[PDB]
Design a protein around this ligand. Structure first.
Ligand code: CA
Length: 83
């Protein structure tokens, strides 16, 4: 889950359904699996709700995970193999 090493694992970033499963959020794979991680992590609360993530808790958990990935990305600390 909120192990930064798991969240930023290139294997998981390149497999969003499994990335979501690691957080127990795979039920939203239907709406999110098409979105590459580089785009996915910047989605906001409003967009997540509009895409079917209706539960406040779920949006908060996604946005927390996203934030961790963004931090590594913006420091150029995500392995280039993920891109
Ligand atoms: Ca929901």
């Amino acid at each position: 889950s909120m192990n930064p090493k798991s969240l930023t694992d290139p294997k998981l970033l390149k497999n969003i359904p499994m990335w979501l499963k690691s957080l127990r959020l795979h039920k939203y794979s239907d709406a999110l699996s098409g979105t590459p991680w580089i785009e996915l992590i910047y989605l906001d609360d409003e967009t997540l709700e509009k895409k079917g993530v209706l539960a406040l808790g779920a949006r908060r958990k996604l946005l927390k995970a996203f934030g961790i990935v963004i931090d590594y990305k913006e420091r150029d600390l995500i392995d280039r193999s993920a891109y």
